[PDB]
Motif scaffolding. Structure first.
Motif, PDB file in Angstrom:
ATOM      1  N   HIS A 188      -6.259  -1.906   7.024  1.00  0.00           N
ATOM      2  CA  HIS A 188      -5.788  -3.184   6.501  1.00  0.00           C
ATOM      3  C   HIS A 188      -4.260  -3.297   6.513  1.00  0.00           C
ATOM      4  O   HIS A 188      -3.738  -4.406   6.464  1.00  0.00           O
ATOM      5  N   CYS A 189      -3.544  -2.175   6.603  1.00  0.00           N
ATOM      6  CA  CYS A 189      -2.078  -2.212   6.570  1.00  0.00           C
ATOM      7  C   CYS A 189      -1.555  -3.088   7.701  1.00  0.00           C
ATOM      8  O   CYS A 189      -1.997  -2.965   8.848  1.00  0.00           O
TER       9      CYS A 189
ATOM     10  N   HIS B   8       0.856  -1.171   0.000  1.00  0.00           N
ATOM     11  CA  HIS B   8       0.000   0.000   0.000  1.00  0.00           C
ATOM     12  C   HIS B   8       0.903   1.235   0.000  1.00  0.00           C
ATOM     13  O   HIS B   8       1.668   1.466   0.946  1.00  0.00           O
TER      14      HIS B   8
ATOM     15  N   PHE C  21      -1.743   0.251  -4.758  1.00  0.00           N
ATOM     16  CA  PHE C  21      -1.128  -0.933  -4.176  1.00  0.00           C
ATOM     17  C   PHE C  21      -0.194  -1.549  -5.209  1.00  0.00           C
ATOM     18  O   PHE C  21      -0.643  -1.909  -6.301  1.00  0.00           O
TER      19      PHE C  21
HETATM   20 ZN   LIG Z   1      -3.239  -0.436   3.784  1.00  0.00          ZN
END
Ligand SMILES: [Zn+2]
Lengths: 197, 21
Positions: free
Chosen positions: B13-14, A11, A32
């Motif tokens: 989500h990281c 990300h 991403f």
């Molecule tokens: Zn993320």
């Protein structure tokens, strides 16, 4: 069209202006990195860093998934230490996964004059709040954050469709602002209130 | 309003550490 499958990738969270990442069109928050030169980046390890190092001043091909467009694209990027800044790309990343990423956004609707929203610089219809410095993973979490910041400054990250850029704003919710609520703008959440594709 | 070289570290989500490359 991701060779290797899966939803893991890196990300992209920061892209320094005028960096090789910026020149390649990498976009913070939305992009991403899923592969580099056909190597699938589906593990948290040193592959990406090492491939960049091996290819200093050599264009590499990245496959990128965007949570803005919901599409894959290829981008050419040239790692370099000659662009003036620090790092071969000028980006910061975290290992992550892109499934669900496009859903955690809040659409700014009408904004009342002189409201906390107006003062913060929120723009009706074209702004989408994309996060804050605390977790927001459900519709109601921005509203909860607003509640917990009654009369306190709150930093929000905001994408704008017209400039196609993200920025930081500071809003101070204030129930005494004169009108309804503490915000003075409408907020939409869900499939009708995501960044236009 | 800040606009420059921002780290948008606001994704739930990281999983990995923040790395500059
Ligand atoms: Zn993320």
């Amino acid at each position: 069209e991701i060779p290797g499958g899966g939803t893991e990738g890196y990300h992209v969270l920061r892209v320094q202006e005028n960096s090789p990442g910026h020149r390649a069109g990498l976009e913070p928050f939305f992009d991403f990195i899923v592969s580099i030169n056909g190597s699938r980046l589906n593990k948290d390890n040193d592959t990406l860093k090492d491939l960049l190092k091996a290819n200093v001043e050599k264009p590499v091909k990245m496959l990128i998934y965007s949570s803005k467009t919901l599409e894959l694209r290829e981008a050419s990027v040239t790692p370099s230490n000659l662009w003036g800044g620090q790092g071969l790309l000028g980006v910061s990343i975290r290992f992550c996964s892109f499934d669900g990423a496009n859903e955690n956004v809040w659409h700014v609707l009408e904004v009342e004059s002189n409201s906390p929203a107006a003062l913060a610089g929120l723009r009706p219809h074209s702004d989408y709040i994309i996060g804050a410095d605390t977790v927001m993973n459900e519709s109601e979490d921005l509203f909860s954050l607003i509640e917990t910041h009654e009369a306190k400054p709150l930093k929000l990250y905001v994408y704008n469709t017209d400039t196609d850029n993200c920025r930081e704003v500071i809003i101070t919710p204030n129930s005494a602002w004169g009108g309804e609520g503490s915000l003075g703008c409408g907020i939409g959440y869900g499939y009708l209130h995501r960044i236009p594709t | 309003t800040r606009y420059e070289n921002i780290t948008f570290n606001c994704c739930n989500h990281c999983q990995g550490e923040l790395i500059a490359l």
